Design a protein around this ligand. Sequence first.
Ligand SMILES: [Mg+2]
Length: 337
Amino acid sequence: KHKYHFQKTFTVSQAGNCRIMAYCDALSCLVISQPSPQASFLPGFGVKMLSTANMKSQYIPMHGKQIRGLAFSSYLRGLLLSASLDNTIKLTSLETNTVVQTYNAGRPVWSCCWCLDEANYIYAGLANGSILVYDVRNTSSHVQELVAQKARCPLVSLSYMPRAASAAFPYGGVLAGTLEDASFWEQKMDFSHWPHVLPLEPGGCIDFQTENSSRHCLVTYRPDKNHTTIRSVLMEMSYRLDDTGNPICSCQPVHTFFGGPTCKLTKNAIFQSPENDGNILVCTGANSALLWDAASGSLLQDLQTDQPVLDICPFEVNRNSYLATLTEKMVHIYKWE
Ligand SMILES: [Mg+2]
C-alpha cells in the first residue's frame, strides 16, 4: 500500500506564531502565516511563500495583527484572501507579491472563505457573529450581511460547499460556525443567502472542512458541555422540502473521531486519496496528526511530530502528492509513496 512518508522539515518562523496555510495549485505555491521576520521587516503579520516546484521563497507583509484565515480562489489565479484581527479582509496577489485590495470590516475578522459557486464573493466572519459578503466588483463595502442567528460571538469558521448534481444534497452555500452555534447559509439562485440551523452545539471552538465530491464536511469542535472533549465528525449533508418547495438543510454524523481535551484546535483536512480511487482521507490534529479512511472509519497512519499540529494541507506538484503539517515554528512535508 502507498502512504505518506516524511520528506523534509522547513523552519518558517524562529519567532513562532505560525497559524495557517493555504495552497495555490496554479502557481505551485504553499503560503504560511507568520509574524514578520524580526528586525528585518516592519512588525506585523504576513505570509511566507514556499515554491513547491523547487521546494525552495519570500515574505509578504499584510496585516497589523494575527491572521485568522487564508484562502485562494479557483477563479482568480493566485489571489490570496486573508482575514485578520486587525479588522480587515485583504486580497494579495502571488503574481504581483503585493496587497491589491483591503476592506475594513470595522471589527476583528475571525474567518474567511471564497464562494465556489458562480460568483467572486468573499465571506468574512466577524467578532460579533455576523458574516459580511463582499463582491470583488465592489471595492468600497459589503453587499450582504448574514446576521448572527443565536449568540453574538466570534464567527471562527467558514467553509464553502459548492452546488452539485447530487440527489443527496445538491445545494451550495457556506457552512458557518461561531463559538456557540452552527448554520448552513444556503446560496439561492438570486445570490442571497438563507440560514439553516445545524444539529451541533458548539461550546468554545469549531472548524468546518469540506469535501466537494462527496457532499461531506468534517466538523471539529467541542460540545457545549461542562466536561467533554474535542471530536471531529464526518457529516453527510441532507435536506427535505418545505410546503413552498424550499429546502430545509441539515446534516448527520457518519463517523465521529474523538480527540483531545482542549480548544486552543487543529485546522484539519479532508481530501481525495492520491490513489484517485474515489476514497477520501480525513486528517486530524498530542504531537501527532492522524489520517483516517473516510469509507471505513479506520486509522491509516499516525504521523509523529515533535510539536502540536496547527494546520494540515495536501498539495500536488509535478504529478506527485504531498502533505504539509504546520507547527508553531516549522512545516513538515510528507510525500505519497
Ligand atoms: Mg486548509
